[PDB]
Enzyme design. Structure first.
Site, PDB file in Angstrom:
ATOM      1  N   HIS A  89       8.302  62.988  60.725  1.00  0.00           N
ATOM      2  CA  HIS A  89       7.946  63.251  59.350  1.00  0.00           C
ATOM      3  C   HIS A  89       6.535  62.737  59.046  1.00  0.00           C
ATOM      4  O   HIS A  89       5.957  61.996  59.823  1.00  0.00           O
ATOM      5  CB  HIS A  89       8.961  62.605  58.421  1.00  0.00           C
ATOM      6  CG  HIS A  89       9.065  61.100  58.556  1.00  0.00           C
ATOM      7  ND1 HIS A  89       9.773  60.484  59.574  1.00  0.00           N
ATOM      8  CD2 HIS A  89       8.540  60.101  57.810  1.00  0.00           C
ATOM      9  CE1 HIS A  89       9.705  59.170  59.422  1.00  0.00           C
ATOM     10  NE2 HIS A  89       8.965  58.913  58.357  1.00  0.00           N
ATOM     11  N   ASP A  97      -1.341  56.838  48.483  1.00  0.00           N
ATOM     12  CA  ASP A  97      -0.854  56.260  49.720  1.00  0.00           C
ATOM     13  C   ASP A  97      -2.060  55.892  50.545  1.00  0.00           C
ATOM     14  O   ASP A  97      -2.956  56.700  50.724  1.00  0.00           O
ATOM     15  CB  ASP A  97      -0.001  57.261  50.487  1.00  0.00           C
ATOM     16  CG  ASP A  97       1.334  57.536  49.822  1.00  0.00           C
ATOM     17  OD1 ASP A  97       2.007  56.583  49.354  1.00  0.00           O
ATOM     18  OD2 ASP A  97       1.732  58.706  49.817  1.00  0.00           O
ATOM     19  N   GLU A 182      14.594  59.890  56.671  1.00  0.00           N
ATOM     20  CA  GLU A 182      15.947  59.817  56.118  1.00  0.00           C
ATOM     21  C   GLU A 182      16.640  61.171  56.199  1.00  0.00           C
ATOM     22  O   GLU A 182      16.019  62.233  56.031  1.00  0.00           O
ATOM     23  CB  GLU A 182      15.847  59.364  54.654  1.00  0.00           C
ATOM     24  CG  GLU A 182      15.344  57.924  54.525  1.00  0.00           C
ATOM     25  CD  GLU A 182      15.041  57.503  53.100  1.00  0.00           C
ATOM     26  OE1 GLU A 182      14.568  58.351  52.312  1.00  0.00           O
ATOM     27  OE2 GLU A 182      15.293  56.310  52.806  1.00  0.00           O
ATOM     28  N   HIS A 296      20.441  55.709  44.051  1.00  0.00           N
ATOM     29  CA  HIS A 296      21.196  54.916  43.132  1.00  0.00           C
ATOM     30  C   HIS A 296      21.166  55.445  41.704  1.00  0.00           C
ATOM     31  O   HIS A 296      22.068  55.163  40.912  1.00  0.00           O
ATOM     32  CB  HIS A 296      20.753  53.448  43.191  1.00  0.00           C
ATOM     33  CG  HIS A 296      19.297  53.242  42.967  1.00  0.00           C
ATOM     34  ND1 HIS A 296      18.752  53.074  41.702  1.00  0.00           N
ATOM     35  CD2 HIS A 296      18.269  53.146  43.839  1.00  0.00           C
ATOM     36  CE1 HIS A 296      17.450  52.878  41.825  1.00  0.00           C
ATOM     37  NE2 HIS A 296      17.132  52.918  43.107  1.00  0.00           N
ATOM     38  N   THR A 338      19.878  51.619  52.750  1.00  0.00           N
ATOM     39  CA  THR A 338      18.895  50.804  51.988  1.00  0.00           C
ATOM     40  C   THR A 338      19.483  50.215  50.707  1.00  0.00           C
ATOM     41  O   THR A 338      20.724  50.144  50.561  1.00  0.00           O
ATOM     42  CB  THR A 338      17.685  51.661  51.755  1.00  0.00           C
ATOM     43  OG1 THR A 338      16.584  50.909  51.234  1.00  0.00           O
ATOM     44  CG2 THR A 338      18.023  52.892  50.849  1.00  0.00           C
ATOM     45  N   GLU A 376      18.404  48.030  54.978  1.00  0.00           N
ATOM     46  CA  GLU A 376      17.013  47.703  54.630  1.00  0.00           C
ATOM     47  C   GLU A 376      16.964  47.386  53.143  1.00  0.00           C
ATOM     48  O   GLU A 376      17.883  47.720  52.389  1.00  0.00           O
ATOM     49  CB  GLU A 376      16.113  48.910  54.863  1.00  0.00           C
ATOM     50  CG  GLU A 376      16.027  49.297  56.309  1.00  0.00           C
ATOM     51  CD  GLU A 376      15.216  50.549  56.591  1.00  0.00           C
ATOM     52  OE1 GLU A 376      15.117  50.895  57.797  1.00  0.00           O
ATOM     53  OE2 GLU A 376      14.702  51.208  55.651  1.00  0.00           O
ATOM     54  N   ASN A 377      15.913  46.736  52.712  1.00  0.00           N
ATOM     55  CA  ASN A 377      15.601  46.685  51.286  1.00  0.00           C
ATOM     56  C   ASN A 377      14.811  47.946  50.959  1.00  0.00           C
ATOM     57  O   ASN A 377      13.982  48.433  51.766  1.00  0.00           O
ATOM     58  CB  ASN A 377      14.806  45.428  50.910  1.00  0.00           C
ATOM     59  CG  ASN A 377      13.547  45.259  51.730  1.00  0.00           C
ATOM     60  OD1 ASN A 377      13.634  45.100  52.934  1.00  0.00           O
ATOM     61  ND2 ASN A 377      12.387  45.208  51.076  1.00  0.00           N
ATOM     62  N   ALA A 378      15.079  48.498  49.785  1.00  0.00           N
ATOM     63  CA  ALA A 378      14.395  49.687  49.273  1.00  0.00           C
ATOM     64  C   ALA A 378      12.950  49.437  48.804  1.00  0.00           C
ATOM     65  O   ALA A 378      12.063  50.269  49.059  1.00  0.00           O
ATOM     66  CB  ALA A 378      15.213  50.305  48.081  1.00  0.00           C
ATOM     67  N   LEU A 379      12.733  48.319  48.123  1.00  0.00           N
ATOM     68  CA  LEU A 379      11.470  48.005  47.500  1.00  0.00           C
ATOM     69  C   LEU A 379      11.017  46.604  47.946  1.00  0.00           C
ATOM     70  O   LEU A 379      11.842  45.726  48.266  1.00  0.00           O
ATOM     71  CB  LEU A 379      11.629  48.083  45.970  1.00  0.00           C
ATOM     72  CG  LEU A 379      11.951  49.460  45.394  1.00  0.00           C
ATOM     73  CD1 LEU A 379      12.204  49.439  43.903  1.00  0.00           C
ATOM     74  CD2 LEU A 379      10.785  50.418  45.770  1.00  0.00           C
TER      75      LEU A 379
HETATM   76  O1  LIG Z   1      12.866  53.023  55.836  1.00  0.00           O
HETATM   77  C1  LIG Z   1      12.960  54.323  55.269  1.00  0.00           C
HETATM   78  C2  LIG Z   1      12.679  54.255  53.752  1.00  0.00           C
HETATM   79  N1  LIG Z   1      13.688  53.470  53.060  1.00  0.00           N
HETATM   80  C3  LIG Z   1      13.646  53.496  51.616  1.00  0.00           C
HETATM   81  C4  LIG Z   1      12.309  52.888  51.185  1.00  0.00           C
HETATM   82  O2  LIG Z   1      12.273  52.839  49.732  1.00  0.00           O
HETATM   83  C5  LIG Z   1      11.145  53.680  51.837  1.00  0.00           C
HETATM   84  O3  LIG Z   1       9.856  53.159  51.482  1.00  0.00           O
HETATM   85  C6  LIG Z   1      11.284  53.719  53.382  1.00  0.00           C
HETATM   86  O4  LIG Z   1      10.294  54.607  53.932  1.00  0.00           O
HETATM   87  C7  LIG Z   1       9.035  54.057  54.369  1.00  0.00           C
HETATM   88  O5  LIG Z   1       9.156  53.222  55.543  1.00  0.00           O
HETATM   89  C8  LIG Z   1       9.664  53.914  56.698  1.00  0.00           C
HETATM   90  C9  LIG Z   1       9.865  52.875  57.802  1.00  0.00           C
HETATM   91  O6  LIG Z   1       8.624  52.283  58.117  1.00  0.00           O
HETATM   92  C10 LIG Z   1       8.765  55.110  57.070  1.00  0.00           C
HETATM   93  O7  LIG Z   1       9.370  55.832  58.184  1.00  0.00           O
HETATM   94  C11 LIG Z   1       8.568  56.054  55.884  1.00  0.00           C
HETATM   95  O8  LIG Z   1       7.651  57.136  56.118  1.00  0.00           O
HETATM   96  C12 LIG Z   1       8.079  55.238  54.685  1.00  0.00           C
HETATM   97  O9  LIG Z   1       7.942  56.093  53.548  1.00  0.00           O
END
Ligand SMILES: OC[C@H]1NC[C@H](O)[C@@H](O)[C@@H]1O[C@H]1O[C@H](CO)[C@@H](O)[C@H](O)[C@H]1O
Length: 487
Positions: A89, A97, A182, A296, A338, A376-379
């Site tokens: 992706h 960004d 994702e 969410h 996440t 993972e954490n989202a933010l």
């Molecule tokens: O890890 C996947 C995504 N999880 C939810 C978060 O809010 C996103 O920021 C996160 O994506 C970001 O980080 C990943 C992992 O490094 C990357 O693959 C994505 O392009 C990036 O947007």
């Protein structure tokens, strides 16, 4: 008393451009310095995007692994483990960004004569961050299909990185399945006309998905059926639309058919690419993972509208995550979810947002299907409360004093490494978090060993996958607060 079975591994995501936008490893000294701080904190490993656009940028099968091998050598020499994301992706491409890495130019060139290789919305807008699942098996890319390009990339990765695999450095392969890695549709394009907490849009208008829906609708005797037209637009709320409103058309026969179709397509996309990944990594001591997006917002309303548009057909009486989990089972694939840091009280009221309950639902679905689940954490978060929320989710029933707890996350990956993280108060908070995740034990380099990856079990039909949707089960009970907080 032996609390070892409580240890939860902690990984840290590297910077998005750990490898430069020119496919060069240019930040080696700075990263080594940051990795020393992570090792000082007892981190088990790191996670990194392995960007398709960087590695296969020249042309088909012109893989350039030079920068990535340098990076992996550095991680190995730091004594850290490695989770590798097969990142099919685009990175960035939003305002503003800092890091922007598209998919390969020669892949995008195909879209000049065939713009339907991209997920397309009902306005005709093309999303260039990822290839539609509609072309997974269409031989459009100098004779290869998208799935073939993904398989070939993973094969080249395995061959080139075999020494890191055999040495136990690379322990996890996260298979990117959509935007941001994702398994979802790009329903919430933040720089192209969505703002949080909009309901988002169905992104199924590419001609390949239109033809697939037509065939699916015909197979059940409804050649006349089309995509819903009462769905509003990206920044609507549910009651703005006839489709998503309470008692709306999402409940109708046509609505149910469409939502099953849309969500099933994502499930099938995951299954077919995971089958390929499983064949590639057969016999290696690695975990294969997918990433499920944390939608969410609107979780509290009957339509779960944002989940629906992202491709998660999740309702009060329909478990749209346990179907996904059931598909993962044959592959022995894990869920990486996440929002593990979020409290409901942290969200705006108008977003109708329930991250805690969503996390609980996804974790419980995974565990009921026998899967490993990681988060993972989202933010970005640096505060003790965020870490204490992660800890709660990591061990929902708290510590078992004599053996493994009943449920636990297999791992947690922190977003993300930066200079800000590893200094001052942020660092002190982070080090203490890691100790608590490890149940106050030192780093265990031998923890959670992976058996050689077995071949995927028998393919199961979508009808078989969907038996997991109903009856919807209550989540496993989660403690309100962790019993091992940071302080
Ligand atoms: O890890 C996947 C995504 N999880 C939810 C978060 O809010 C996103 O920021 C996160 O994506 C970001 O980080 C990943 C992992 O490094 C990357 O693959 C994505 O392009 C990036 O947007």
């Amino acid at each position: 008393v032996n609390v070892k079975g409580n240890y939860v591994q902690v990984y840290v995501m590297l910077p998005l451009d750990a490898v430069s936008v020119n496919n060069r490893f240019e930040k080696g000294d700075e990263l080594r310095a940051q990795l020393r701080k992570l090792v000082e904190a007892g981190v088990d490993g790191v996670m990194v995007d392995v960007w398709w656009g960087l590695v296969e940028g020249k042309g088909p099968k012109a893989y350039d692994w030079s920068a990535y091998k340098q990076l992996f050598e550095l991680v190995q020499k730091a004594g850290l483990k490695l989770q590798a994301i097969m990142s099919f992706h685009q990175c960035g491409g939003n305002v503003g960004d800092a890091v922007n890495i598209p998919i390969p130019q020669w892949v995008r060139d195909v879209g000049t004569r065939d713009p339907d290789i991209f997920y397309t919305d009902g306005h005709g807008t093309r999303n260039i961050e990822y290839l539609t699942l509609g072309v997974d098996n269409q031989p459009l890319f100098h004779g290869r299909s998208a799935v073939q390009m993904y398989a070939d990339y993973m094969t080249s990765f395995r061959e080139n990185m075999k020494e890191f695999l055999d040495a136990g450095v690379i322990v996890d392969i996260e298979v990117g399945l959509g935007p941001a890695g994702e398994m979802r549709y790009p329903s919430y394009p933040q720089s192209h006309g969505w703002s949080f907490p909009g309901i988002g849009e169905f992104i199924c208008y590419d001609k390949y998905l239109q033809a697939d829906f037509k065939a699916a609708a015909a197979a059940v005797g409804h050649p006349e059926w089309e995509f819903p037209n009462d769905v509003g637009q990206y920044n609507d709320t549910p009651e703005r639309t006839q489709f998503f409103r309470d008692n709306g058309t999402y409940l109708s026969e046509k609505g149910r058919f469409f939502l099953a179709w849309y969500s099933n397509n994502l499930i099938k996309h995951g299954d077919r690419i995971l089958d390929e990944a499983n064949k590639v990594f057969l016999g290696y001591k690695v975990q294969l993972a997918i990433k499920i997006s944390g939608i969410h917002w609107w979780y509290k309303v009957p339509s779960h509208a944002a989940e629906l548009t992202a491709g998660y057909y999740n309702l009060h009486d329909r478990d749209g995550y346990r179907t996904i989990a059931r598909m993962l089972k044959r592959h022995r694939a894990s869920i990486n979810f996440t929002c593990a840091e979020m409290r409901d009280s942290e969200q705006s009221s108008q977003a109708m947002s329930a991250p805690e309950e969503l996390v609980q639902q996804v974790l419980s679905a995974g565990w009921r299907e026998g899967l490993n689940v990681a988060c993972e954490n989202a933010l970005p978060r640096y505060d003790p409360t965020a870490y204490n929320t992660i800890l709660r989710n990591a061990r929902p029933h708290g510590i078992n004093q004599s053996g493994p707890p009943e449920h636990k996350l297999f791992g947690f990956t922190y977003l993300r490494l930066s200079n800000q993280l590893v200094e001052g108060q942020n660092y002190a908070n982070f080090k203490t978090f890691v100790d608590r995740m490890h149940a106050n034990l030192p780093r265990d380099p031998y923890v959670d060993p992976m058996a050689p990856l077995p071949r995927s079990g028998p393919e199961i039909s979508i009808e078989m996958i969907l038996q997991a949707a109903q009856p919807k089960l209550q989540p496993f009970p989660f403690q309100e607060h962790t019993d091992l907080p940071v302080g």
